[PDB]
Design an enzyme around this catalytic site. Sequence first.
Site, mmCIF file in Angstrom:
data_model
loop_
_atom_site.group_PDB
_atom_site.id
_atom_site.type_symbol
_atom_site.label_atom_id
_atom_site.label_comp_id
_atom_site.label_asym_id
_atom_site.label_seq_id
_atom_site.Cartn_x
_atom_site.Cartn_y
_atom_site.Cartn_z
ATOM 1 N N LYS A 7 0.893 -1.246 0.228
ATOM 2 C CA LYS A 7 -0.210 -0.074 -0.053
ATOM 3 C C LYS A 7 0.839 1.075 0.212
ATOM 4 O O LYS A 7 1.865 1.356 0.478
ATOM 5 C CB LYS A 7 -1.220 -0.254 1.317
ATOM 6 C CG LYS A 7 -2.086 1.158 0.931
ATOM 7 C CD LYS A 7 -3.382 0.367 0.471
ATOM 8 C CE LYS A 7 -4.623 0.676 0.191
ATOM 9 N NZ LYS A 7 -5.382 -0.255 0.002
ATOM 10 N N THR A 67 -4.245 -5.669 1.520
ATOM 11 C CA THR A 67 -3.237 -3.966 1.119
ATOM 12 C C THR A 67 -4.194 -3.089 2.195
ATOM 13 O O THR A 67 -3.785 -2.522 2.526
ATOM 14 C CB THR A 67 -2.903 -3.764 -0.320
ATOM 15 O OG1 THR A 67 -4.632 -3.290 -0.673
ATOM 16 C CG2 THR A 67 -2.170 -4.180 -1.392
ATOM 17 N N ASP A 68 -6.212 -3.377 1.969
ATOM 18 C CA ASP A 68 -6.909 -2.156 2.729
ATOM 19 C C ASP A 68 -6.363 -2.268 4.871
ATOM 20 O O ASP A 68 -6.379 -1.829 4.860
ATOM 21 C CB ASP A 68 -7.775 -2.488 2.154
ATOM 22 C CG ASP A 68 -8.781 -1.327 3.349
ATOM 23 O OD1 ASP A 68 -9.011 -0.338 2.700
ATOM 24 O OD2 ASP A 68 -9.910 -1.937 4.070
ATOM 25 N N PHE A 172 30.963 27.877 -13.334
ATOM 26 C CA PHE A 172 30.751 26.638 -13.696
ATOM 27 C C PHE A 172 31.659 26.533 -15.280
ATOM 28 O O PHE A 172 31.297 26.983 -16.172
ATOM 29 C CB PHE A 172 28.726 26.406 -14.381
ATOM 30 C CG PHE A 172 29.806 24.814 -15.461
ATOM 31 C CD1 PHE A 172 30.237 23.828 -14.324
ATOM 32 C CD2 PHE A 172 29.298 24.239 -16.487
ATOM 33 C CE1 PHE A 172 29.685 22.334 -14.788
ATOM 34 C CE2 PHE A 172 29.317 22.864 -16.688
ATOM 35 C CZ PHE A 172 29.478 22.352 -16.310
ATOM 36 N N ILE A 237 28.327 22.075 -9.592
ATOM 37 C CA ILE A 237 26.868 21.422 -8.493
ATOM 38 C C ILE A 237 27.817 20.390 -7.897
ATOM 39 O O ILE A 237 27.744 20.102 -7.001
ATOM 40 C CB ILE A 237 25.922 21.200 -9.353
ATOM 41 C CG1 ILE A 237 24.562 21.811 -9.159
ATOM 42 C CG2 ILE A 237 25.118 20.379 -8.265
ATOM 43 C CD1 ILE A 237 23.559 21.833 -9.778
ATOM 44 N N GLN A 238 28.196 19.686 -8.831
ATOM 45 C CA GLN A 238 29.392 18.190 -8.061
ATOM 46 C C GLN A 238 30.069 19.176 -6.987
ATOM 47 O O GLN A 238 30.113 17.749 -5.714
ATOM 48 C CB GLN A 238 30.141 17.531 -9.052
ATOM 49 C CG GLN A 238 29.194 17.019 -10.215
ATOM 50 C CD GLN A 238 28.561 18.048 -11.474
ATOM 51 O OE1 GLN A 238 28.511 19.002 -11.288
ATOM 52 N NE2 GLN A 238 29.135 17.298 -12.346
ATOM 53 N N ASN A 264 19.904 20.287 -11.248
ATOM 54 C CA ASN A 264 20.331 21.882 -11.599
ATOM 55 C C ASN A 264 19.314 22.632 -12.091
ATOM 56 O O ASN A 264 18.694 22.121 -13.241
ATOM 57 C CB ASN A 264 21.305 21.828 -12.695
ATOM 58 C CG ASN A 264 22.369 23.380 -12.883
ATOM 59 O OD1 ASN A 264 21.278 24.236 -12.421
ATOM 60 N ND2 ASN A 264 23.420 23.416 -13.246
HETATM 61 C C1 LIG Z 1 25.088 24.681 -16.141
HETATM 62 N N1 LIG Z 1 25.542 22.837 -16.176
HETATM 63 C C2 LIG Z 1 25.348 21.780 -17.009
HETATM 64 O O1 LIG Z 1 25.166 22.266 -18.679
HETATM 65 N N2 LIG Z 1 26.208 20.799 -16.748
HETATM 66 C C3 LIG Z 1 26.414 21.022 -15.746
HETATM 67 C C4 LIG Z 1 26.871 20.321 -14.701
HETATM 68 O O2 LIG Z 1 27.682 18.937 -14.495
HETATM 69 N N3 LIG Z 1 27.170 20.492 -13.385
HETATM 70 C C5 LIG Z 1 26.703 21.929 -13.027
HETATM 71 O O3 LIG Z 1 27.195 22.337 -11.581
HETATM 72 N N4 LIG Z 1 26.565 22.528 -13.990
HETATM 73 C C6 LIG Z 1 26.428 22.227 -15.231
HETATM 74 C C1 LIG Z 2 -8.993 -4.161 -2.102
HETATM 75 N N1 LIG Z 2 -7.855 -4.578 -1.956
HETATM 76 C C2 LIG Z 2 -6.896 -4.810 -1.413
HETATM 77 O O1 LIG Z 2 -6.990 -4.049 -0.026
HETATM 78 N N2 LIG Z 2 -5.885 -5.655 -1.199
HETATM 79 C C3 LIG Z 2 -5.557 -6.148 -2.823
HETATM 80 C C4 LIG Z 2 -4.891 -6.855 -3.064
HETATM 81 O O2 LIG Z 2 -4.056 -7.334 -2.821
HETATM 82 N N3 LIG Z 2 -5.171 -7.055 -4.356
HETATM 83 C C5 LIG Z 2 -6.442 -6.715 -4.804
HETATM 84 O O3 LIG Z 2 -6.746 -7.680 -6.090
HETATM 85 N N4 LIG Z 2 -7.380 -6.544 -4.082
HETATM 86 C C6 LIG Z 2 -7.207 -5.782 -3.100
#
Ligand SMILES: Cn1c(=O)[nH]c2c(=O)[nH]c(=O)[nH]c21
Ligand SMILES: Cn1c(=O)[nH]c2c(=O)[nH]c(=O)[nH]c21
Lengths: 294, 304, 303, 296
Positions: A7, A67-68, A172, A237-238, A264
Amino acid sequence: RVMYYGKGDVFAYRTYLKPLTGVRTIPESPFSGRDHILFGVNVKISVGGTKLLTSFTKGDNSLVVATDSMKNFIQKHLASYTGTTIEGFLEYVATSFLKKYSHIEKISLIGEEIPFETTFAVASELVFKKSRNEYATAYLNMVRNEDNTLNITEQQSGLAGLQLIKVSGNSFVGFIRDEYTTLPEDSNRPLFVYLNIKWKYKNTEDSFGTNPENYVAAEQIRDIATSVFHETETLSIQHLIYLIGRRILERFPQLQEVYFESQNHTWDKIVEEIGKVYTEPCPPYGFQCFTVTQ
Amino acid sequence: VMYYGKGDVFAYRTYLKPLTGVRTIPESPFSGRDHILFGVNVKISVGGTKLLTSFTKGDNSLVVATDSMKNFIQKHLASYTGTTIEGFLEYVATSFLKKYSHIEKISLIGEEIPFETTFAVKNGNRAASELVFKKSRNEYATAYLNMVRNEDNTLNITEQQSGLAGLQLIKVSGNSFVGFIRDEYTTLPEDSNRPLFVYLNIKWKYKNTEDSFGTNPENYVAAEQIRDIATSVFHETETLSIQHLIYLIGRRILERFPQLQEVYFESQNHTWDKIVEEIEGKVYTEPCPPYGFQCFTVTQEDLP
Amino acid sequence: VMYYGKGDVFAYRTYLKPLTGVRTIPESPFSGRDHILFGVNVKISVGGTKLLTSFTKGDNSLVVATDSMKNFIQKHLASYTGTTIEGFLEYVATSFLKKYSHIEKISLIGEEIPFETTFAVKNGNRAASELVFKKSRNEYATAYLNMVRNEDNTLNITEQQSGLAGLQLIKVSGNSFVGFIRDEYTTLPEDSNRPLFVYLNIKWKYKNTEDSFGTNPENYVAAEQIRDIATSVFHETETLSIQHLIYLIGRRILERFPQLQEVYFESQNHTWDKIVEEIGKVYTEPCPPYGFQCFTVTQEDLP
Amino acid sequence: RVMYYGKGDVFAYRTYLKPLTGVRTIPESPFSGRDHILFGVNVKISVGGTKLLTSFTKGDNSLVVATDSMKNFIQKHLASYTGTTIEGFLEYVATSFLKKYSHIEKISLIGEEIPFETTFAVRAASELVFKKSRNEYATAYLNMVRNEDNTLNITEQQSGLAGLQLIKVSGNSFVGFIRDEYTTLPEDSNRPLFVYLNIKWKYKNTEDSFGTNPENYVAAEQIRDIATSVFHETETLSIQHLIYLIGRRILERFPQLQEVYFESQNHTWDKIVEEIGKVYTEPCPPYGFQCFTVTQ
Ligand SMILES: Cn1c(=O)[nH]c2c(=O)[nH]c(=O)[nH]c21
Ligand SMILES: Cn1c(=O)[nH]c2c(=O)[nH]c(=O)[nH]c21
Ligand SMILES: Cn1c(=O)[nH]c2c(=O)[nH]c(=O)[nH]c21
Ligand SMILES: Cn1c(=O)[nH]c2c(=O)[nH]c(=O)[nH]c21
């Protein structure tokens, strides 16, 4: 084989979770804890186990947790959770789920904070602003071993969606130029970066907030990033994210590694002389992925 | 981890060589693509140990500007003489590594921008226009390719995957979800007849990567054919769950296409809640945000 | 200003009464809708001077909960015996004002959730499925209706509009944009041959509002037909601008459909930038600013 | 009729705009001005005039100012703008555009602020690094016409704050509403009200919107803080009740204003656990909304 189900977008909001207190502060950040008057999380849960196979091949639903019901599980556990972090909550859910359903061999959880900011009232303890800006993240994977012991196999915390612009003191230049190069060199650009930052702890327990002195708050990572961006005459950034990473690992020696996924989105210049005027660039965006360890 | 590149590189090409000579299947009328208009959104990522100092020292001497990567992709679409997105990616990847010998790895993602035909009345009849097309936001073909440069300067593909993304299918009846675990966490009713709504991403891998390029089109598996297998199998099947459905779709795919090794499904459940049961018609509405999903691979071992 | 209501009320109905008996046009093969599946997204706004104190005093006694409006809409889709979104809105609007006598005005927007046919192999042949449908994120029909309650308790429609929203068309050649003003602000080159990309919203109004409902289908203008007129005219026309294009689409609409009073266009330009001129050519996505045109074609323009 | 054309998503960023200072403060808000190290606006321009008709009816582009040129006009004009407000920037563009192109009879401008927030650097607020925000932002709207006597007139002006998402965890009720066959909503004496707010205001005197006399300018940041203060102070009875009170406080604090318009939406969470703090979850798609004008 790949075989999982679960879930996504399980939202859960809790009022008056146990406050996070006693964090170690660092110079870059005023962060000192979380009041948790309001705590929201968006959870995605994925589970697998070999015994799930017949639910696919035969349409046998005998071992299918709906899952309910997983949504319900997560929501009720937020009500009972007695800890202080999103990381700790995921561990609570994972452990509890695997102890409940023994045929599940693997659970993988992602948690995304819904951030709420404070507001002024004639600082409110009642009214909060739902934010669409940066937010904390947590990731946890847990397995049941063949001896029925449980183990965390992966844990990662993060900060997502941080959009920073530095108006000057960025260059950069010096990059490869050939038949495909039209980008002019720029010795002073207004670098715009979109940052996702993720870290792993040396000891997984430190992420839970049990010993809060060891907990690394996303708020603190946010402020390290802005301080380092400010201090740095960036060459790319690296170059920037490496230095952000190094500062993080210096500030938090309990961390093993920091991962960056940056984009970025720097503006195009329209008027050089006149202050200056810029505009939004075209759709293509540059990106960088990098790990500093440690 | 150390990679960098460019996303959302859009490129539109008119009059690409048509895709024809494909092999048909019963589930699908697909017979090829005339490629009057061909559109792709590309993401490129590159790696190599020699890029380290661009991070650690701020030395850009070995950095290919991502803006240049954009130009490279777009200019290569102009000279591409092939017929598929998969082949276009292979063309870009190979050219790029040949051009930039210090780069060791490249990863490419291509997503079709789909266009649909429209009608016009010209010269006395209503017929498909060769000029006017409708840009579609519905399902679209995908391709993925990773290639490395080896020490001896040869290039190898280390992963290739084709796909159909964003297929939204609702079947109004002939679906059940019963017999699942009902315990203290369960509030989902059993339903012997639901209008199952599935969001489908289907991804396939070839036994021989060469079949993905379209150079021998009879071995090419078109996303449009996969789409039609998916809609046919959904219709044919009294589904017992989404799990049950996607297994049967994968089986049909791998039976129809023996050149394929495996098929991977990422599906989401967006089935409507019922509001009015009686009233043969009914009324439903949009459910709340939580969505179920399934991740499943059908392989050679699943075939008889 | 004082209105409140509910948005994003989705409602999906199976086996609505089909739309048939429509009148055809040369530009369109449209012959009707079988309505195995009918979906609408509805927004309802209501007003009335008696709602004032809900605002000024926090008194809720005359307030219809917006949740109840949602139930109202969804339930009425179940009882609707008609065949168009326009008629569904009139049914909802009429019922609502009849139910709540202190409500003086109601505004309704309905947006079609469009579904497309898919193929299946069954009983030996490949044919259109009566069970499986593809939800479409492309163009969709719209309807708009405003109704008031008069002092004698009668109801009147005060505005009705139908439409087609989100049609994205690209014509690869046979388009120019030349001869525009070239002054100290102009960096756009003249272009005798561009691949014009238009994002179209087209809205029409009827001379008699009753024709919008589908009750006499021969008078109903289907959004699918408007779609095909737009593609047909775009094709037929060596366009001189988007302005030029949409005027000619409107003329064709009004000429084909004399029961229409006027047609309004909201268009946007998303024409790609040229990257390679000689190889077929290559283009890419432009930067974010988009041109747009807002224009009504009317009876006086005919014829 | 209707006959307009223009350009949307004209983004323009200016560094070091003249700072807005000398603003009248209020109790609810700490706002005192804008440094304007970084100023961003998203502009939409629409123009009309009867002489544009043949560009539609004949394909005659002779009188067509290209929308691309409009974009250039706006960006270039931000470079030369000497003022301190988005409202003032819109009047500058409108006046200059009409003065330039005499065949244009009407121009409509929408400006939306791209908000930037301050960040920390080491130990104070950075004068170089700002955070781009996706939260609430200032807006401005201006319509200007050329009359038959060639005088120019502002026919509509409106300032705004958009995109404000507030949640009050308790001290809100919604009871006493109509219950009939279509009502299933339970009465709630204590809900966690979530409102999405758009707030728009009009000045008695249009020139006050320009910032030439800063003491008379009403800043969107001040409106934001009034909204949160009133929400805090109020045991709300409905969203309708709240926005009336927010409106009244705005008009009392800013007597230079003629009106305040509200467009609000209700996105309150469903309760899942009432007794443990509580737990709530996201509701289904339908959203309530309210539209209301308070006047002075
Ligand atoms: C502007 N920019 C890119 O085009 N590549 C990268 C990157 O790898 N790392 C950056 O910090 N800047 C930047
Ligand atoms: C309604 N429902 C649950 O709550 N669990 C599950 C599940 O595991 N599988 C289902 O097909 N339905 C369902
Ligand atoms: C390219 N282009 C502009 O810049 N403006 C306009 C316009 O008003 N109409 C067009 O058809 N094209 C165009
Ligand atoms: C919960 N709720 C509705 O259903 N309608 C309304 C309304 O009009 N106003 C509210 O404050 N709440 C609410």
